[PDB]
Write an enzyme that holds these catalytic residues in place. Structure first.
Site, PDB file in Angstrom:
ATOM      1  N   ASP A 144       0.581  -1.160  -0.182  1.00  0.00           N
ATOM      2  CA  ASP A 144       0.082  -0.162   0.051  1.00  0.00           C
ATOM      3  C   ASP A 144       0.836   1.403   0.166  1.00  0.00           C
ATOM      4  O   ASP A 144       0.499   2.234   0.640  1.00  0.00           O
ATOM      5  CB  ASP A 144      -1.103   0.184   1.135  1.00  0.00           C
ATOM      6  CG  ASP A 144      -2.003   1.096   0.960  1.00  0.00           C
ATOM      7  OD1 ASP A 144      -2.239   1.474  -0.095  1.00  0.00           O
ATOM      8  OD2 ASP A 144      -2.635   1.449   2.044  1.00  0.00           O
ATOM      9  N   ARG A 178      -0.130   8.992   0.721  1.00  0.00           N
ATOM     10  CA  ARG A 178      -0.996   9.420   1.799  1.00  0.00           C
ATOM     11  C   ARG A 178      -0.364   8.375   2.995  1.00  0.00           C
ATOM     12  O   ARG A 178      -0.581   8.548   4.120  1.00  0.00           O
ATOM     13  CB  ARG A 178      -2.343   8.730   1.516  1.00  0.00           C
ATOM     14  CG  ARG A 178      -2.580   7.086   1.344  1.00  0.00           C
ATOM     15  CD  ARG A 178      -4.034   6.658   1.034  1.00  0.00           C
ATOM     16  NE  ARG A 178      -4.037   5.575   0.465  1.00  0.00           N
ATOM     17  CZ  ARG A 178      -3.800   5.048  -0.834  1.00  0.00           C
ATOM     18  NH1 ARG A 178      -3.837   6.410  -1.711  1.00  0.00           N
ATOM     19  NH2 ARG A 178      -3.624   3.975  -1.319  1.00  0.00           N
ATOM     20  N   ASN A 179       0.527   7.181   2.576  1.00  0.00           N
ATOM     21  CA  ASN A 179       1.175   6.618   3.724  1.00  0.00           C
ATOM     22  C   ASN A 179       2.578   6.786   3.991  1.00  0.00           C
ATOM     23  O   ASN A 179       3.341   6.128   4.251  1.00  0.00           O
ATOM     24  CB  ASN A 179       0.900   5.107   3.009  1.00  0.00           C
ATOM     25  CG  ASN A 179      -0.411   4.756   3.274  1.00  0.00           C
ATOM     26  OD1 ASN A 179      -1.285   5.270   4.120  1.00  0.00           O
ATOM     27  ND2 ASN A 179      -0.808   3.594   2.439  1.00  0.00           N
ATOM     28  N   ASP A 182       2.050   2.537   7.506  1.00  0.00           N
ATOM     29  CA  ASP A 182       0.789   1.898   7.226  1.00  0.00           C
ATOM     30  C   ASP A 182       1.181   0.434   6.666  1.00  0.00           C
ATOM     31  O   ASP A 182       0.952   0.356   5.585  1.00  0.00           O
ATOM     32  CB  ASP A 182      -0.181   2.766   6.181  1.00  0.00           C
ATOM     33  CG  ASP A 182      -1.490   2.444   6.297  1.00  0.00           C
ATOM     34  OD1 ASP A 182      -1.855   1.339   6.095  1.00  0.00           O
ATOM     35  OD2 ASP A 182      -2.173   3.464   6.678  1.00  0.00           O
TER      36      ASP A 182
HETATM   37  C1  LIG Z   1      -4.459  10.102   5.399  1.00  0.00           C
HETATM   38  C2  LIG Z   1      -5.281  10.189   6.913  1.00  0.00           C
HETATM   39  O1  LIG Z   1      -6.273   9.425   7.289  1.00  0.00           O
HETATM   40  N1  LIG Z   1      -4.335  10.365   7.943  1.00  0.00           N
HETATM   41  C3  LIG Z   1      -2.673  10.904   7.949  1.00  0.00           C
HETATM   42  C4  LIG Z   1      -2.678  11.949   9.111  1.00  0.00           C
HETATM   43  C5  LIG Z   1      -3.367  10.769  10.082  1.00  0.00           C
HETATM   44  N2  LIG Z   1      -2.670   9.741  10.642  1.00  0.00           N
HETATM   45  C6  LIG Z   1      -1.518  10.166  11.197  1.00  0.00           C
HETATM   46  N3  LIG Z   1      -1.174  11.357  11.305  1.00  0.00           N
HETATM   47  C7  LIG Z   1       0.097  11.571  12.189  1.00  0.00           C
HETATM   48  N4  LIG Z   1       0.369  12.959  12.775  1.00  0.00           N
HETATM   49  C8  LIG Z   1      -0.240  14.273  12.300  1.00  0.00           C
HETATM   50  C9  LIG Z   1      -1.429  14.010  11.260  1.00  0.00           C
HETATM   51  C10 LIG Z   1      -1.946  15.380  11.100  1.00  0.00           C
HETATM   52  C11 LIG Z   1      -1.211  16.658  11.325  1.00  0.00           C
HETATM   53  N5  LIG Z   1      -1.975  17.800  10.974  1.00  0.00           N
HETATM   54  C12 LIG Z   1      -3.029  18.181  11.549  1.00  0.00           C
HETATM   55  C13 LIG Z   1      -3.496  19.757  11.052  1.00  0.00           C
HETATM   56  N6  LIG Z   1      -3.445  19.962   9.813  1.00  0.00           N
HETATM   57  C14 LIG Z   1      -3.700  21.450   9.291  1.00  0.00           C
HETATM   58  C15 LIG Z   1      -1.989  19.366   9.147  1.00  0.00           C
HETATM   59  C16 LIG Z   1      -1.947  18.253   9.537  1.00  0.00           C
HETATM   60  C17 LIG Z   1      -0.126  16.485  12.068  1.00  0.00           C
HETATM   61  C18 LIG Z   1       0.512  15.379  12.518  1.00  0.00           C
HETATM   62  C19 LIG Z   1       1.057  10.500  12.864  1.00  0.00           C
HETATM   63  N7  LIG Z   1       1.841  10.565  13.555  1.00  0.00           N
HETATM   64  C20 LIG Z   1       2.496   9.329  13.690  1.00  0.00           C
HETATM   65  N8  LIG Z   1       1.547   8.373  13.014  1.00  0.00           N
HETATM   66  C21 LIG Z   1       1.738   6.880  13.194  1.00  0.00           C
HETATM   67  C22 LIG Z   1       0.468   6.118  12.779  1.00  0.00           C
HETATM   68  C23 LIG Z   1       2.752   6.359  11.924  1.00  0.00           C
HETATM   69  C24 LIG Z   1       0.493   9.222  12.484  1.00  0.00           C
HETATM   70  N9  LIG Z   1      -0.611   8.726  11.739  1.00  0.00           N
HETATM   71  C25 LIG Z   1      -4.578  10.469   9.350  1.00  0.00           C
END
Ligand SMILES: CC(=O)N1CC[C@H](Nc2nc(Nc3ccc(N4CCN(C)CC4)cc3)c3ncn(C(C)C)c3n2)C1
Length: 307
Positions: free
Chosen positions: A141, A145-146, A159
């Site tokens: 995958d 996005r990942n 992911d």
């Molecule tokens: C595509 C999807 O469904 N996703 C991708 C992000 C999230 N998964 C994730 N996010 C992490 N951190 C994160 C996420 C969004 C932000 N901002 C928030 C404020 N916005 C203006 C801009 C971005 C900041 C930090 C994250 N950190 C570690 N992991 C692990 C699971 C690998 C994360 N997964 C879910």
């Protein structure tokens, strides 16, 4: 021994060591949280993401497969599990990647991303994937996005919800039903449900295209059921505006029908590394020379020469 013993430690962390602080992401599956981990007695606060999902015995089986894989990897360009919490529904604890996923990042900062950043990301993603291939691991995958952003200078692949480990004499993974993202899939995968490192390379190619177009959707508008037909006829994603034929030719090669004719990740590392040495010779970006986010043509540093 038939195969090599996987001696990774799975770490189990007390609920009272974490502190959810904010939802980060939600939808489908479960939600992802931002938090702090404060190991007992230590004097350390570790920014973490906490990923969960109501309790169904089908879910916990799958989140633990994911922890298994995430606990087996250790590389600067892969996200590893810090541990799991055994609450009513099992939580995965990972390092926080503060800038979110790379897809949203290039969309959001489209106008401030210079060629140096784009090519460096390609080098880093290729290094992560080459590592996953070393660990005999097919990701299945790979996509923009990942990929997550620890800093604008540093990304990591994430992911492993579909990742598979391969025997020392197995060279394909024969899959089944279940929604796989068709628009990042190699052709063999869509017709025969075969997956290899080389079909990860195809997905790498699509991911690079996502970056070069600052976050466009592959075959936007086209219904998935059509993709296999498009591909078979010989059609591919279009050359991105900023891309020299040098760069686009690499994307095209990741999309050869004959999977052994596609580049190896360790080659992708070398090729992009050389282009990263003279970024503006390979990506043409209006205003490139002044961008900010928070003959030796063939020289490659040993760190990027991996055989
Ligand atoms: C595509 C999807 O469904 N996703 C991708 C992000 C999230 N998964 C994730 N996010 C992490 N951190 C994160 C996420 C969004 C932000 N901002 C928030 C404020 N916005 C203006 C801009 C971005 C900041 C930090 C994250 N950190 C570690 N992991 C692990 C699971 C690998 C994360 N997964 C879910």
């Amino acid at each position: 021994s038939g195969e090599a013993p996987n001696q990774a430690l799975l770490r189990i962390l007390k609920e009272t060591e974490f502190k959810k602080i904010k939802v980060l992401g939600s939808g489908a599956f479960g939600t992802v949280y931002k938090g702090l981990w404060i190991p007992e007695g230590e004097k350390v606060k570790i920014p973490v993401a906490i990923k969960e999902l109501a309790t169904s015995p089908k879910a916990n089986k799958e989140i633990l497969d994911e922890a298994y894989v995430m606990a087996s990897v250790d590389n600067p360009h892969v996200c590893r599990l810090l541990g799991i919490c055994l609450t009513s529904t099992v939580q995965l604890i990972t390092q926080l990647m503060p800038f979110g996923c790379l897809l949203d990042y290039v969309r959001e900062h489209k106008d401030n991303i210079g060629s140096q950043y784009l090519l460096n990301w390609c080098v880093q993603i290729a290094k992560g994937m080459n590592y996953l291939e070393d660990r005999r691991l097919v990701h299945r995958d790979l996509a923009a996005r990942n990929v997550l952003v620890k800093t604008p200078q540093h990304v990591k692949i994430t992911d492993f919800g579909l990742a598979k480990l391969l025997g020392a004499e197995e060279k394909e993974y024969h899959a089944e039903g279940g929604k796989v993202p068709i628009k990042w899939m190699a052709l063999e995968s869509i017709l025969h449900r075969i997956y290899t490192h080389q079909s990860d390379v195809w997905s790498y190619g699509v991911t690079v295209w996502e970056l070069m177009t600052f976050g466009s959707k592959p075959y936007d508008g086209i219904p998935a059921s059509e993709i296999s037909s498009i591909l078979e006829k010989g059609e591919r994603l279009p050359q991105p505006p900023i891309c020299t034929i040098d760069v686009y030719m690499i994307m095209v090669k990741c999309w050869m029908i004959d999977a052994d004719s596609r580049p190896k990740f360790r080659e992708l590392i070398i090729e992009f590394s050389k282009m990263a040495r003279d970024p503006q010779r390979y990506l043409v970006i209006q205003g490139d020379e002044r961008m900010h986010l928070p003959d030796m043509d063939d020289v490659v540093d040993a760190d990027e020469y991996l055989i």
